Design brief:
Belongs to the influenza viruses PA family. The protein is α+β, with helices and mostly antiparallel strands. It has one domain: Restriction Endonuclease (3-Layer(aba) Sandwich). It is built from seven helices and five strands; from the N terminus they run αααβαββαββαα. The chain has a five-stranded mixed sheet with strand order 1-2-3-4-5, with helices on both faces. Helix 2 crosses helix 3 and helix 3 packs antiparallel against helix 6. The radius of gyration is 16 Å and the shape is globular. The two termini are 22 Å apart. Bound molecules: ligand KU5 and manganese (II) ion (MN) (2 copies).
């Protein structure tokens, strides 16, 4: 039972992102052939995390997302024993060596405001920095400190809106939007 959205995902994102997304879904027990909207969302989040880590200086960001659970926890252990940063309750997506904080990247189809709240009660880890992006182009970050400069965030926002368009021209957006 192969969907249009599954085939759109595979052509839309690059093969390394797709395969990491597949690994992640199967690891948590989900099927990208069936949970296709989730498939699309994991790839999007992954790509955003990668573009984010690319926006800084060379060795600025450690990438936690996209790794298998054990190795992701391993590097945060090491980050924590190297920095004395508090061990987060849940896996963050990045670590910032310049500002010395873990980052949780959010990608939402609803209001920046609502999702940001859900993400802060969900972690309660006072330490980790939160950065939300939406498919319509808005962002909110902890303490209004958006970490990267403006052109890097704008690149991410542009790609998000392109994903939205390519979906909509395939009549796939409405189903994707009401899935979250
Ligand atoms: O990394 C995430 N989850 C795994 C690490 S975690 O469980 O420690 C955790 C959990 C929650 C937050 C950070 C960390 C992560 N999850 C999500 C969304 C909303 C929260 C749960 N959720 C899921 O999709 C769970 S299912 C799943 C998870 C990962 C891959 C595939 C599937 Cl199917 N939103 C994010 O922005 C985000 O980064
Ligand atoms: Mn994550
Ligand atoms: Mn995230």
């Amino acid at each position: 039972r192969g969907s249009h959205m599954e085939d759109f995902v595979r052509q839309c994102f690059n093969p390394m992102i797709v395969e990491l997304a597949e690994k992640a879904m199967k690891e948590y027990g989900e099927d990208p052939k069936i949970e296709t909207n989730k498939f699309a969302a994991i790839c999007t989040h992954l790509e955003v995390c990668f573009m984010y880590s690319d926006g800084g200086s060379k060795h600025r960001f450690e990438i936690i997302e996209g790794r298998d659970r054990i190795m992701a926890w391993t590097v945060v252990n090491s980050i924590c024993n190297t920095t004395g940063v508090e061990k987060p309750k849940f896996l963050p997506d990045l670590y910032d060596y310049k500002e010395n904080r873990f980052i949780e990247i959010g990608v939402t189809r609803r209001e920046v405001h609502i999702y940001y709240l859900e993400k802060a009660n969900k972690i309660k880890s006072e330490k980790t920095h939160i950065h939300i992006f939406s498919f319509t182009g808005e962002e909110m970050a902890t303490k209004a400190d958006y970490t990267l400069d403006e052109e890097s965030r704008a690149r991410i926002k542009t790609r998000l809106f392109t994903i939205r368009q390519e979906m909509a021209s395939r009549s796939l957006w409405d189903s994707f939007r009401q899935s979250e």
